[PDB]
Design a protein around this ligand. Structure first.
Ligand SMILES: Cc1cc2nc3c(=O)[nH]c(=O)nc-3n(C[C@H](O)[C@H](O)[C@H](O)COP(=O)(O)OP(=O)(O)OC[C@H]3O[C@@H](n4cnc5c(N)ncnc54)[C@H](O)[C@@H]3O)c2cc1C
Length: 455
């Protein structure tokens, strides 16, 4: 019986195991995860008001219920067990542990209270234990988000949705209460390039424009010559661009003009501005604005690079959210790493110079794909791995798998969480969300979670 194992239980991992299980009748797959619960960013990243995006959990679960698959929660690879150990124990090892860091802003004042990375702000509301005590000061009246992608859109939306519309989501009870007292009435999504280079997608952009109680603030001037450049543009790009174009230059209607008129909150899109410095409040105890450098685009097409003009702009705010870039981290000494592209060097999923060591998901291609890309691309990694297996390019005969690895964990006093254990944790989250109308009220304390399991 071939023994394969994966590191990370997000889409990369589950989808790679899914393929392995479907295309190899007797292989056994073990999924190691550092958090106590599986699913990674489907649970800690996808916003709470996008439950439909989280329905892939339904396919993760049927994969995890195969009699040849087992989940190992609460096992931090590169600390509880090394990659080499995993490598000696199994015939193949798949690195799929995402891209955990965020790229720092690297600008003076980035330390000031009120400056957060967008991904941490999402973990706060998404119940990722390490962000539980993030306690953001939502008492200011404005928030600036650096970077124009969906993550930026996601936090903007959550800071402006009227709290009652969030009430039946799976957002944490604690974050909900923070939003209820929030005084944040305006959200600027600042980018350094232009409308052509925003990275968001149409489903999010239109949810932003139709978000009850809010009114968009686009400057007509940013969209000059827009309709002329997108003339040749493919459907996706063009539709998006006309949606931005239309919202920026057309007069609305009598009902939509009126709705915008009475909206208490607002959100805009700023362009050709790059983060230069976080501005201090008079007393130095918090952020009170951000110093932006004016930029001008040069070069053609997909190769346009902003260049400073020399001009700067001070933009007041009491919250600076950075969402410009996630990067993988080197997990074990023995694992190759490309610090530039924050990825583990590989050739279609085969790690550079280390037989039996594969990769998939963000750690394989960079932090760009959405779940479907990650989905399909992960099946490509499973294809290679099983081809190498079939060609006999993995060690032969017999490997112990979990039998060996379980021993090491036991001896180190690491208590692994099985799939069943997660099912017991799931039940409790559901039961405690019933009283308040929610799909679940997430468990934030690992000790508490371990004790409900009997440890
Ligand atoms: C805020 C946000 C919102 C998003 N919204 C959407 C959306 O709406 N739709 C969409 O299609 N995509 C969305 N995405 C993109 C999607 O989240 C990614 O495509 C996808 O989850 C990346 O999959 P992954 O399996 O590589 O990594 P991840 O999902 O990050 O997870 C990999 C797993 O590895 C585990 N792990 C990490 N280190 C270790 C270790 N040392 N030992 C053991 N286990 C470890 C992590 O805990 C994690 O569970 C969003 C991303 C973000 C950040």
């Amino acid at each position: 019986t071939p023994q394969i194992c994966v590191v990370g239980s997000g889409p990369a991992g589950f989808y790679t195991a899914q393929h392995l299980l479907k295309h190899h009748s007797r292989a056994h797959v073990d999924i190691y995860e550092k958090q106590l619960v599986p699913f990674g960013l489907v649970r800690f990243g996808v916003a709470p008001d996008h439950p439909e995006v989280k329905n892939v959990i339904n396919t993760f679960t049927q994969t995890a219920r195969s009699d040849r698959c087992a989940f190992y929660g609460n096992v931090e690879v590169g600390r509880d067990v090394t990659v080499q150990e995993l490598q000696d124990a199994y015939h193949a090892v798949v690195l799929s542990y995402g891209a955990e860091d965020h790229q720092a802003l690297d600008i003076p004042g980035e330390e000031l209270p009120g400056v957060f990375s967008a991904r941490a702000f999402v973990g706060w509301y998404n119940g990722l234990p390490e962000n539980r005590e993030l306690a953001p000061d939502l008492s200011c009246d404005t928030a600036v988000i650096l970077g124009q992608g969906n993550v930026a859109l996601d936090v903007a939306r959550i800071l402006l949705t009227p709290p009652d519309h969030l009430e039946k989501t799976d957002i944490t009870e604690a974050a909900l209460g923070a939003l209820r007292q929030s005084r944040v009435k305006t959200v600027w999504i600042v980018g350094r390039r232009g409308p052509l280079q925003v990275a968001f997608t149409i489903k999010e952009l239109r949810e932003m424009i139709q978000l009850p109680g809010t009114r968009p603030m686009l400057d007509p001037a940013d969209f000059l010559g827009l309709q002329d450049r997108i003339k040749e543009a493919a459907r996706p790009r063009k539709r998006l661009m006309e949606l931005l174009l239309r919202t920026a230059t057309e007069k609305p209607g009598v009902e939509e003009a009126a709705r915008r008129a009475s909206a208490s909150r607002a959100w805009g899109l700023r362009f050709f501005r790059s983060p230069q410095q976080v501005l201090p409040s008079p007393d130095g105890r918090r952020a009170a604005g951000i110093r932006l450098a004016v930029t001008r685009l040069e070069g053609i097409g997909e190769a346009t690079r902003a260049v400073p003009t020399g001009d700067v702009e001070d933009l007041p705010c009491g919250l600076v959210l950075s969402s410009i870039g996630y990067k993988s981290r080197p997990i074990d000494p023995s694992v190759p790493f490309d610090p530039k592209l924050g990825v583990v060097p590989n050739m279609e999923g085969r790690v550079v110079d280390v037989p039996g060591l594969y990769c998939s998901g963000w750690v394989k291609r960079g932090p760009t794909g959405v779940i479907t890309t990650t989905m399909t691309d992960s099946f490509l990694t499973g294809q290679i791995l099983l081809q190498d297996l079939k060609a006999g390019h993995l060690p032969s005969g017999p490997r112990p798998g979990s039998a060996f690895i379980k021993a090491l964990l036991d001896s180190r006093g690491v208590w692994p969480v099985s799939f069943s254990d997660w099912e017991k944790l799931d039940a409790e989250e559901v039961s405690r969300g019933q009283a308040s109308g929610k799909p679940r009220e997430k468990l934030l304390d690992p000790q508490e979670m371990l004790r409900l399991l009997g440890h």
